[PDB]
Ligand binder design. Structure first.
Ligand SMILES: NS(=O)(=O)C(F)(F)C(F)(F)C(F)(F)C(F)(F)F
Ligand SMILES: [Zn+2]
Length: 258
């Protein structure tokens, strides 16, 4: 069993290969808005994506991702709850089979149709492999998707998905500007957590934006036409590629806003 999202290899099985799945700082979590504490010491988030260089778009059999040149400080996250500078490596999404599920984080138990993760690593560790071994190695910016109006800045992504249908396919994907995926407000919740896929390392400062973006039904339908399987294997729609909320345990979720 390679891990996945199915009955026999999904999230409830992951602890067998990755025992940290039952750890003290696992992600995602439910964000209980009434118990999150406003922290006036939290700084505004600094998102500097003007010089981003996208490279490729890839179906990895679990999601699709857009990868960036992370060999220089071109697209960086700073400020917020963070110390130092975090380079953008990639973004990807989690989504559902229907609009009432798909997000990893939840808000007062509400599930969104999808969740966008912009993955960044701390430059003090030099490379992402080293960063995942550190408790402050990664910063993932999470953005909820609800279904309504289209997000124009997402359309270039969805229009190429037919070229990466099955696991193992990739395409050139240059000049994509991730600023077109961001909501108006950068108000956020933050807490210490983990990767939400294997190896589930406890290396992430999570930053989850309060404001969702809206995407159209046609845009999310194109996500749902992707396949978990490789070409030639039985077709299994890439849907419900989300890990459920995990126990908060001894953690405090902090809000940047009142
Ligand atoms: N969902 S998530 O924690 O962003 C993640 F996909 F697991 C991930 F962090 F991006 C990751 F895949 F583990 C990696 F960091 F390797 F990119
Ligand atoms: Zn993710």
């Amino acid at each position: 069993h390679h891990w996945g999202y199915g009955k026999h290899n999904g999230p409830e099985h992951w602890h067998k290969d990755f025992p940290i799945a039952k750890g003290e700082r696992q992600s995602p979590v439910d964000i209980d808005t009434h118990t999150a504490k406003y922290d006036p010491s939290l700084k505004p988030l600094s998102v500097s994506y003007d010089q981003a260089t996208s490279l490729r778009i890839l179906n990895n059999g679990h999601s699709f991702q857009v990868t960036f040149d992370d060999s220089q400080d071109k697209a960086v996250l700073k400020g917020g709850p963070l110390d130092g500078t975090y380079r953008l490596l990639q973004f990807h999404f989690h989504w559902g089979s229907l609009d009432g599920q798909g997000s990893e984080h939840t808000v007062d138990k509400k599930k969104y149709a999808a969740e966008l993760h912009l993955v960044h690593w701390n430059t003090k560790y030099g490379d992402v492999g080293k960063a995942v071994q550190q408790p402050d190695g990664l910063a993932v910016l999470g953005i909820f998707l609800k279904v309504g109006s289209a997000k124009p800045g997402l359309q270039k992504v969805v229009d190429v998905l037919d070229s990466i249908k099955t696991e193992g396919k990739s395409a050139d994907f240059t000049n994509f500007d991730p600023r077109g995926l961001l909501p108006e407000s950068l108000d956020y919740w933050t807490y210490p957590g983990s990767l939400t896929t294997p190896p589930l390392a406890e290396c992430v400062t999570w930053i989850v934006l309060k404001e969702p973006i809206s995407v159209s039904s046609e845009q999310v339908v194109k996500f749902r036409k992707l396949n978990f399987n490789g070409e030639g294997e039985p077709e299994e729609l890439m849907v419900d590629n989300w890990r459920p909320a995990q126990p908060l345990k001894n953690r405090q979720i902090k809000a940047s806003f009142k």
